[PDB]
Amino acid sequence: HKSEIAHRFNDLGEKHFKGLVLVAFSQYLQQCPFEDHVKLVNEVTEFAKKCAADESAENCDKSLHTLFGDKLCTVATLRATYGELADCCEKQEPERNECFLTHKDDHPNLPKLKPEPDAQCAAFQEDPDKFLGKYLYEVARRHPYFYGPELLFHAEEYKADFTECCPADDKLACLIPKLDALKERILLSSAKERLKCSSFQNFGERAVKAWSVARLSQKFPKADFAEVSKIVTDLTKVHKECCHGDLLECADDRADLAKYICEHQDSISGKLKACCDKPLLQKSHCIAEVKEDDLPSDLPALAADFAEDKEICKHYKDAKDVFLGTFLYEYSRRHPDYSVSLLLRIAKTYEATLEKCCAEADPPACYRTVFDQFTPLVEEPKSLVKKNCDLFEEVGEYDFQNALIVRYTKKAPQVSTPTLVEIGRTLGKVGSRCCKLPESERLPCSENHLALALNRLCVLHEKTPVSEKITKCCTDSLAERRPCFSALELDEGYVPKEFKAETFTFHADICTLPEDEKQIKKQSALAELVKHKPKATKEQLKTVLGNFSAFVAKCCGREDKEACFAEEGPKLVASSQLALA
Ligand SMILES: COc1ccc2cc(CCC(C)=O)ccc2c1
Ligand SMILES: COc1ccc2cc(CCC(C)=O)ccc2c1
Ligand SMILES: CCCCCCCCC(=O)O
Numbered sequence: 158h159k160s161e162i163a164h165r166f167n168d169l170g171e172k173h174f175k176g177l178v179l180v181a182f183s184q185y186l187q188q189c190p191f192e193d194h195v196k197l198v199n200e201v202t203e204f205a206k207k208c209a210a211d212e213s214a215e216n217c218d219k220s221l222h223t224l225f226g227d228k229l230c231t232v233a234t235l236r237a238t239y240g241e242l243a244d245c246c247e248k249q250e251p252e253r254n255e256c257f258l259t260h261k262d263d264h265p266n267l268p269k270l271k272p273e274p275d276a277q278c279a280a281f282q283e284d285p286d287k288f289l290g291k292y293l294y295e296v297a298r299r300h301p302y303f304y305g306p307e308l309l310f311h312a313e314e315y316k317a318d319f320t321e322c323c324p325a326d327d328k329l330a331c332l333i334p335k336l337d338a339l340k341e342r343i344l345l346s347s348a349k350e351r352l353k354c355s356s357f358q359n360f361g362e363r364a365v366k367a368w369s370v371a372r373l374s375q376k377f378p379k380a381d382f383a384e385v386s387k388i389v390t391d392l393t394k395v396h397k398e399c400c401h402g403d404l405l406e407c408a409d410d411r412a413d414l415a416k417y418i419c420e421h422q423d424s425i426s427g428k429l430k431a432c433c434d435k436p437l438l439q440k441s442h443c444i445a446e447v448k449e450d451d452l453p454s455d456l457p458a459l460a461a462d463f464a465e466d467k468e469i470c471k472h473y474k475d476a477k478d479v480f481l482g483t484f485l486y487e488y489s490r491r492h493p494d495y496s497v498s499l500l501l502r503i504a505k506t507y508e509a510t511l512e513k514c515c516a517e518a519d520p521p522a523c524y525r526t527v528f529d530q531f532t533p534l535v536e537e538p539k540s541l542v543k544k545n546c547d548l549f550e551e552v553g554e555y556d557f558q559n560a561l562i563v564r565y566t567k568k569a570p571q572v573s574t575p576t577l578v579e580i581g582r583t584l585g586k587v588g589s590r591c592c593k594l595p596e597s598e599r600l601p602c603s604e605n606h607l608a609l610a611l612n613r614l615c616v617l618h619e620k621t622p623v624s625e626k627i628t629k630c631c632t633d634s635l636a637e638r639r640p641c642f643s644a645l646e647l648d649e650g651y652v653p654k655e656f657k658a659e660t661f662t663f664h665a666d667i668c669t670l671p672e673d674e675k676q677i678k679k680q681s682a683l684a685e686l687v688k689h690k691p692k693a694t695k696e697q698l699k700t701v702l703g704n705f706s707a708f709v710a711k712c713c714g715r716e717d718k719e720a721c722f723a724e725e726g727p728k729l730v731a732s733s734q735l736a737l738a
Contacts (some may be wrong), residue, residue, distance in 0.1 A: 162201075186229070190711075230246040263619065265298065296343060311346070365396060462527055463507070503534055572618075647691055663712075686698060697736060704733065
């Protein structure tokens with residue numbers, strides 16, 4: 158292309174071009190204000206228009222990285238606010254772009270997005286474009302690896318809520334649940350896409366391909382190998398581009414990929430009918446979250462080819478990655494009931510068997526029982542899901558969350574209480590989302606969502622490294638992560654935390670808080686109890702936190718609330734030390 162910026166501007170249209178450019182800038186520069194980002198967008202969009210007029214003009218021949226990166230470096234107060242990104246600005250490309258990605262702050266800890274109905278409806282009415290602009294800006298900076306196109310989709314959902322609710326009767330009760338539901342759907346899409354980007358960063362491109370081969374095979378079992386090969390290759394290119402900042406290239410390839418999938422929807426999946434009769438961004442979102450197609454009756458038996466055949470060791474050694482890819486494709490089609498990580502574990506086990514058996518004297522008899530090696534890999538996570546769902550349905554989300562906070566604070570007591578609480582709470586959501594489902598779907602739901610929860614923990618752990626055991630689980634193997642985390646126990650090497658009185662000191666302010674904010678306060682205390690008494694049984698801790706909850710409920714209903722906390726607080730905390738012995 159003679160001018161790439163004009164090419165993208167022409168293809169994407171002005172609205173999406175502007176939107177995606179804003180997101181791109183908002184992700185790299187979290188701290189800068191909205192007013193500043195708008196002008197950068199405006200300036201770029203103008204330049205793109207100039208190039209679209211005359212492609213052989215001054216600087217129009219330059220690459221997107223060059224143009225975007227130069228514009229990033231013009232920003233006012235860049236060295237003061239972003240010392241890291243100012244060091245990058247001196248470099249040429251691609252070194253400078255590579256520098257920018259390294260220094261994206263994976264968590265800035267900005268204020269939580271509190272919906273303000275009246276003021277937002279006011280801003281929505283006066284200028285809806287600038288209002289959606291703020292949505293893009295605010296979400297993008299809170300999630301530096303969010304997918305541009307998918308974020309544009311959630312902006313239309315966001316807008317749809319404000320059109321339905323601002324002229325309507327009660328502004329609070331209309332928006333609040335819709336913007337809570339939207340924020341839940343924002344967190345999940347962010348988590349899914351952060352796993353893909355983390356997988357490139359930590360494990361490389363082959364790990365993303367393998368995950369994608371497995372997931373897509375499950376979703377499109379009717380699709381032949383060549384169609385899946387196309388989709389994976391192209392989808393991996395889309396994901397690689399979005400993760401490495403190339404949002405304009407990502408949007409173009411994503412749309413082209415969704416276009417291909419729908420042109421060939423007959424032969425790929427019956428479930429794509431609804432998705433293909435929809436507009437651009439809606440269509441792509443539907444394909445990505447499409448339900449798995451029903452099992453074809455004519456799925457081939459695999460023992461003949463992958464277990465019984467006499468020349469497997471020959472076929473493996475010719476093209477290892479091709480033979481395993483095929484196995485993975487075929488074995489994933491026939492198992493929607495397995496999780497993605499389980500299928501990759503099974504594939505790694507299959508590889509390992511061939512590596513071993515094709516060194517031995519009689520290979521066929523060795524690898525003849527290769528499928529039976531999978532049994533223990535399948536049974537472990539099945540009964541872990543049953544055990545956790547049995548517990549979840551007994552005690553509910555709050556106590557299930559508490560059971561996991563205890564479980565993980567023991568595994569990693571050196572990790573910060575806010576992190577431990579967050580991860581434990583997210584793991585408890587897996588209980589809510591998966592245990593209600595039909596029992597066949599529990600395993601894939603659980604482990605796939607655990608991959609999101611655990612990658613989040615691993616991302617936070619890069620930011621604040623603490624435990625060597627977590628580093629190992631997070632970095633040794635993508636497929637073995639969840640089993641690795643499960644295999645952790647309390648290390649005796651941890652020195653029990655010293656009993657500061659202020660750590661378990663509650664006051665009247667808790668009573669005014671909402672339900673989840675009360676819980677987080679108690680759950681922070683729960684984690685602090687495990688840090689002080691590592692060896693306390695989970696059953697001891699449950700007793701003690703019950704006494705905390707009661708104490709909170711009691712003093713919140715007292716005449717003099719603060720007098721109750723001041724009086725009963727120290728008494729509870731003193732007797733709690735003894736009860737955890
Ligand atoms: C259905 O919801 C859940 C929620 C948390 C789970 C955590 C694990 C990992 C187990 C350990 C020891 O970390 C297994 C399965 C789990 C199932
Ligand atoms: C209120 O705080 C807790 C803390 C730990 C818990 C652990 C479990 C797991 C098994 C049992 C019943 O102790 C159940 C519920 C729990 C409730
Ligand atoms: C063709 C099968 C490739 C399996 C790749 C497994 C990725 C998990 C890992 O070991 O990091």
